[PDB]
Amino acid sequence: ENQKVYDITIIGGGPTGLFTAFYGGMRQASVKIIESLPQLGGQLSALYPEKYIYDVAGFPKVRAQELVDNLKEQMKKFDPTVCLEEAVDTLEKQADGIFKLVTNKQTHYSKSVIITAGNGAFQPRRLELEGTAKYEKKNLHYFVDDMNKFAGKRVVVFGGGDSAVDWTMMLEPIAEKVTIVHRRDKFRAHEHSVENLMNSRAEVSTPYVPVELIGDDKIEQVVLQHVKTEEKVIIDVDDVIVNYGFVSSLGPIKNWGLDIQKNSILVNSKMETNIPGIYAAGDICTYEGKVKLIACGFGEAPTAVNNAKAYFDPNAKLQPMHSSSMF
Amino acid sequence: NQKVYDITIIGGGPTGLFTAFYGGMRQASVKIIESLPQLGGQLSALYPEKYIYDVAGFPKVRAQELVDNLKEQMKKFDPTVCLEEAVDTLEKQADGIFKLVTNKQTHYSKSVIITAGNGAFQPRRLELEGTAKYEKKNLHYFVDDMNKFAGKRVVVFGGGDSAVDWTMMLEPIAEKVTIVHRRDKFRAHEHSVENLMNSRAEVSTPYVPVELIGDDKIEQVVLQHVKTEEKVIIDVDDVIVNYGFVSSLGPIKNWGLDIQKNSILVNSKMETNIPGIYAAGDICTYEGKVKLIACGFGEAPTAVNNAKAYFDPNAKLQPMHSSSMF
Ligand SMILES: Cc1cc2nc3c(=O)[nH]c(=O)nc-3n(C[C@H](O)[C@H](O)[C@H](O)COP(=O)(O)OP(=O)(O)OC[C@H]3O[C@@H](n4cnc5c(N)ncnc54)[C@H](O)[C@@H]3O)c2cc1C
Ligand SMILES: Cc1cc2nc3c(=O)[nH]c(=O)nc-3n(C[C@H](O)[C@H](O)[C@H](O)COP(=O)(O)OP(=O)(O)OC[C@H]3O[C@@H](n4cnc5c(N)ncnc54)[C@H](O)[C@@H]3O)c2cc1C
Ligand code: NA
Ligand code: NA
Numbered sequence: 092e093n094q095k096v097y098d099i100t101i102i103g104g105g106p107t108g109l110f111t112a113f114y115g116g117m118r119q120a121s122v123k124i125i126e127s128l129p130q131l132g133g134q135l136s137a138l139y140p141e142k143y144i145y146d147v148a149g150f151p152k153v154r155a156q157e158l159v160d161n162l163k164e165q166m167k168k169f170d171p172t173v174c175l176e177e178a179v180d181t182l183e184k185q186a187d188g189i190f191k192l193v194t195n196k197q198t199h200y201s202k203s204v205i206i207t208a209g210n211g212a213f214q215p216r217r218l219e220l221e222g223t224a225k226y227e228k229k230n231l232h233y234f235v236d237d238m239n240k241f242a243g244k245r246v247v248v249f250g251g252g253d254s255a256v257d258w259t260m261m262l263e264p265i266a267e268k269v270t271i272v273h274r275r276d277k278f279r280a281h282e283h284s285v286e287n288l289m290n291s292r293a294e295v296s297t298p299y300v301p302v303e304l305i306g307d308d309k310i311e312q313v314v315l316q317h318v319k320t321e322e323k324v325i326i327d328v329d330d331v332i333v334n335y336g337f338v339s340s341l342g343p344i345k346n347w348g349l350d351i352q353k354n355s356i357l358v359n360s361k362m363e364t365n366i367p368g369i370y371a372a373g374d375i376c377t378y379e380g381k382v383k384l385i386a387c388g389f390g391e392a393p394t395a396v397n398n399a400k401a402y403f404d405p406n407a408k409l410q411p412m413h414s415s416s417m418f
Numbered sequence: 419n420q421k422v423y424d425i426t427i428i429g430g431g432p433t434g435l436f437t438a439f440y441g442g443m444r445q446a447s448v449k450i451i452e453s454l455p456q457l458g459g460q461l462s463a464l465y466p467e468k469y470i471y472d473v474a475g476f477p478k479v480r481a482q483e484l485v486d487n488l489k490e491q492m493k494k495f496d497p498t499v500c501l502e503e504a505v506d507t508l509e510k511q512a513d514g515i516f517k518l519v520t521n522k523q524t525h526y527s528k529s530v531i532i533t534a535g536n537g538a539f540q541p542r543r544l545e546l547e548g549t550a551k552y553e554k555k556n557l558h559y560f561v562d563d564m565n566k567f568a569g570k571r572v573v574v575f576g577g578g579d580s581a582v583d584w585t586m587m588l589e590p591i592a593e594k595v596t597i598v599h600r601r602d603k604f605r606a607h608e609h610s611v612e613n614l615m616n617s618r619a620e621v622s623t624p625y626v627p628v629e630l631i632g633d634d635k636i637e638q639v640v641l642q643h644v645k646t647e648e649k650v651i652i653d654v655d656d657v658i659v660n661y662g663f664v665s666s667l668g669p670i671k672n673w674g675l676d677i678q679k680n681s682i683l684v685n686s687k688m689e690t691n692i693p694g695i696y697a698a699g700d701i702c703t704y705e706g707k708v709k710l711i712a713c714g715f716g717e718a719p720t721a722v723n724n725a726k727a728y729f730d731p732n733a734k735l736q737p738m739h740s741s742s743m744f
Contacts, residue, residue, distance in 0.1 A: 110474045110712075117472060145740035146443060147475055148436045148715035149484050151491040152744075158475055165477040360686055361706030380687030380724045382736060386436070389474035390716015398706045410708060414472035415465060415481070 092172060092199070096189055097121045099399060100201035101171075102179050105133020107373030107388035108207035109162040114396040116169025117411055120404075123201070124171055125194060127178040127212035128337075129234060132159040134374075137213050137337045148386050174199070178212045182347045182369075190368060202403040205370040205395045206349075206356060207388075211342055216335040218249065222304050230309050232332045235261065243267045247313050247326055249301055250334035253280040256288055258334055263293045270294040270326060272301060274318055296324065304331065344375075352377065362395035368402065370395040422515055423449045423498070424729055425722065426527035428505050431459020433699030433714035434533035435488040440719045442495025443743055444726045444733075449527070450497055451520060453504040453538040455560060458485040460700075461711075463539050463663045474712050484711075500525075504538045508673045508695075516694060528694070528729040531721050532675075532682060533714075535700040537668055542661040544575065548630050556635050558658040567656060569593045573639050575627060576660035579606040582614055584660055589617045596620040596652060598627060600644050625650065630657065670701075678703060688721035694728065696721040 099115040101108045104126030115122035130136050135144075140156035147153060153161075177194035182204065185191050192199040215233040217223075223231060235258050246266040248259050251273030257280075262269045271288070276297045278285050288295065296315055302323075303314035310331050315324040341354050350357040350365045355377035362370040372395045373388035381387070393411075401409050425441045427434045430452030441448035456462055461470075466482035473479060479487075503520035508530065511517050518525040541559035543549075549557060564587050572592045574585050577599030588595040597614070602623050604611050614621060622641060628649070629640035636657050641650045667680055676683040676691040681703035688696045698721045699714035707713075727735045 106474075114472070142741050143744070145744055146440065146719075148432075148712075148718075149473060149479070149487040149491070150475060151487065151494070153475070161475045161477065165471075165475070168477075359706075360704045363706075378686045380685075380689075380720055380735075382720055382723050384719050386440075386719055387716040390710075390713040392474075393472070393710055393712055394706055394708055397708045409706070411710070415468040415470055418469070418471055418478075 092123075094200075095121075096200045096202060097123045097172070098202050098403060099123070099396065100125065100190070100192060100199060100204050101207055102182075102192075102204065103133065103207035103209060103373070103375075104128075104131040104173070104175075105207060105209050105373065106135055106159060106162055106385060107209070107392055108133070108205075109159070109166060110389050111205055111207055111372060111392040111396060112171045113162070113166035113169070114393040116166065116171065117393075117414065117417075118396060118400045118407070120396075120400060122169065122171035123174060123199065125174045125177050125179055125192070125199065127176070127214065129176045129236065131163060131173070131175075132156065133209050133213075135159050144385065146384060146386060147389070178214075178343075180343045184366065184368065188368065203368045203370065203399040205362075205372060205392075205399060206344070206364075206375060207371070207373045207392070208341075208344060209339070209374045210354070211339040211344060211375075213337050213339050215333065216338045218301075218333045218335070220301065220304060225308075226304065226306070226310055226331075230330045231304075232330060233334075235332060238262065238265055241266045241330060244329040245327060246270070246330045246332060247272060247328045248332045248334060249273075250336075251275065251278050251280075251297075252334065252336060253284070254336070255334035256280045256284050258332065259293050260284065260287060260291070262332075263291050267329075268292075268294070270296055270328075272296045272299050272313075272315060274298050274300050296326075299324065355381075360394075361398040362391055363398065368399075370399055420526075421447075422526040422528060423447045424528050425449070425531060425725060426451065426516070426518060426525060426529070427497075427531050427533055428508075428518075429459065429533035429535060429699070429701075430454075430457040430499070430501075431533060431535050431699060431714075432461055432485065432488060432711050433535075433718055434459070434531075435485070435492055436715055437531050437533055437698060437718040437722060438497040439488070439492045439495065440722045442492075442497065443740065444722055444737055446722070446726060446730075448495065448497035449500060449525065451500045451503050451505055451518070451525065453502070453540065455502045455562070457489060457499070457501075458482065459535055459539075461485050470711070472710065472712065473715070504669075506669045510692065510694060514694065529725040530695045531688075531718075531725060532670070532690075532695065532697045532701060533699045533718070534667075534670060534697075535665070536680070537665040537670065539663050539665050541659065542664045544627070544659045544661070546627065546630060552630065552632070552636050552657075556656045557630075558656060559660075561658065564588065564591060567592050570655040571653060572596070572656045572658060573598060573652060573654050574658045574660060576662075577601060577604050577606070578660065578662060579610070580662075581660040582606040582610050584658065585619050586610065586613055586617065589619045594618075594620065596622055598622045598625050598641060600624050600626050622650065622652075681707075686720075687724040688717055689724065696725055
């Protein structure tokens with residue numbers, strides 16, 4: 092890329108966007124996936140990677156994350172450009188019909204856009220304390236990418252979920268001290284992971300809620316409050332890590348000039364929105380009879396690709412070659 | 419039965435199989451009616467050995483193995499499967515129930531989802547003027563149990579992989595088996611042809627059958643060399659044709675449906691022009707429609723859920739997550 096006009100840009104790397112990316116390869120289009128999170132997989136990877144799915148055609152029983160791995164494998168053949176940690180904010184048609192898409196990182200350009208944004212861009216749930224916002228460019232963390240930057244550091248983890256415990260286990264042998272804070276004594280996690288949390292050098296502050304962060308520019312202390320007694324505890328830290336889960340909402344998608352009803356983008360049977368060049372597929376799209384199912388999003392995706400391919404490549408046919416004759 | 423089913427499915431291809439599974443997920447009584455004595459549609463009939471690359475979640479899957487997965491997925495709710503039946507008439511009766519007549523029996527249904535592809539599959543027929551009268555006897559297009567040919571004299575017509583395969587299966591079973599093809603080069607796997615030559619199988623090449631002889635059962639077969647036009651005659655107990663499969667819409671065009679270029683026109687609820695009748699898969703069309711197995715997989719639950727809302731108005735269009743049905 093740089094300055095490069097792609098053919099098909101996909102907003103959303105959930106399962107629908109992954110299969111959209113694959114089928115863009117089947118039609119020889121230059122393909123981009125733009126995804127809000129630093130991982131692909133949408134609801135499947137973020138909100139339930141361990142559940143079994145029973146209604147994808149041809150899988151009597153498949154685990155959610157292994158379906159996403161299958162999908163990433165299937166597309167690996169045409170190597171689409173994946174742009175993680177980017178949330179599309181503005182989307183406009185410029186004077187010559189090309190789309191300009193602006194994220195928090197950069198500008199992208201595209202001949203057609205297939206929005207597969209599901210229930211909207213995923214963000215980690217924000218910490219609800221009025222001071223916090225100023226710390227995000229410093230030592231308040233919602234992701235634990237490069238874990239070794241916490242070697243010999245004092246670190247606190249807010250959250251009582253399965254994901255929160257696991258990040259604690261990962262940090263206890265890395266950090267000088269690690270502490271986990273949750274408002275009830277029962278953690279919402281696996282018995283073996285709680286047992287391993289209990290039996291380690293990680294301090295477990297329950298039933299408390301954080302009530303204050305102290306620091307001029309970097310966080311330096313955290314104030315906790317017992318939920319029953321109202322007594323307080325103070326902790327010195329080098330880094331604070333929030334893990335309250337994920338949230339999603341349409342957000343800026345409602346400012347792109349699209350026809351939207353009950354948080355769904357309206358499409359016709361070509362997966363076309365009201366703006367020539369823009370398509371939608373998967374949980375975010377709707378039409379008469381639409382059913383929010385993964386098998387249905389997998390059918391909408393090649394319809395959108397094949398119709399978009401006919402929109403930007405006037406010398407191409409709507410029907411693709413049999414895949415059994417291409418490899 | 420006399421039983422009026424909720425969902426009767428015409429066609430046991432990949433689309434119909436998944437349609438049937440999803441009818442179980444919505445707790446409708448479900449029947450599949452299929453022409454062949456096997457499920458799998460185009461996948462099982464026409465290319466059961468090729469690899470498919472563009473079904474979601476399978477980077478590379480063998481066509482017959484995808485069909486086996488689908489049948490596995492379907493056994494969970496045990497739909498009533500009716501093989502070797504081709505639906506010939508389809509009528510809405512006075513009370514709104516659908517009557518379907520096959521070559522075997524009559525069926526009734528509240529709703530019908532046509533997943534018929536390019537039409538009913540039949541074996542490509544032997545093109546000779548007598549023939550048809552022998553089909554109730556010893557002219558064979560299907561072989562359930564190969565051991566019914568033990569110690570019999572058998573001739574096999576065909577030059578394809580399946581013809582060679584049925585011949586190799588008969589070689590230790592039959593007193594004598596002969597295979598007939600109009601060219602010397604068989605259109606079959608080079609290695610399997612080698613086994614044929616090095617076996618007790620007689621290879622009558624390059625010949626064409628030109629006459630079947632017999633009062634009621636076939637008793638002899640007359641062959642003709644393709645270059646010299648000399649003739650050979652062979653005594654037989656059974657004749658087995660293996661020329662492949664053929665398909666056409668046939669009676670589907672006599673059901674009052676809106677049809678365009680061999681496709682049933684549907685809207686986005688998979689509805690045809692007749693309330694109570696739906697279509698999904700290769701046989702249905704609409705603006706932007708693409709003939710792909712994944713698209714048939716997405717059209718299938720659309721048709722089920724919209725049909726569930728049609729025949730059970732006190733039930734919801736959207737079902738909860740699949741993780742709570744197991
Ligand atoms: C607990 C649970 C169980 C479920 N079980 C089943 C089941 O058994 N069967 C079934 O069929 N369905 C099931 N579903 C629903 C299924 O997950 C959805 O049908 C499917 O995940 C939607 O896929 P998608 O790609 O359309 O959307 P998503 O999975 O939501 O992916 C959209 C992606 O786009 C990203 N994104 C959005 N906006 C932007 C933006 N502006 N810029 C960049 N990225 C953006 C999001 O962060 C996300 O990663 C379940 C859902 C849940 C929550
Ligand atoms: C060689 C070849 C390779 C292909 N490769 C691919 C590929 O890689 N990817 C892809 O997506 N698609 C591929 N396709 C297309 C794919 O096979 C079709 O999309 C798919 O088979 C459609 O499934 P279906 O169940 O809708 O129809 P079908 O598979 O045609 O099944 C319809 C069934 O209905 C039965 N039937 C019809 N009429 C009646 C009746 N009146 N009564 C009773 N039974 C009836 C038939 O006997 C048949 O079993 C290929 C097709 C061919 C021929
Ligand atoms: Na401990
Ligand atoms: Na079918």
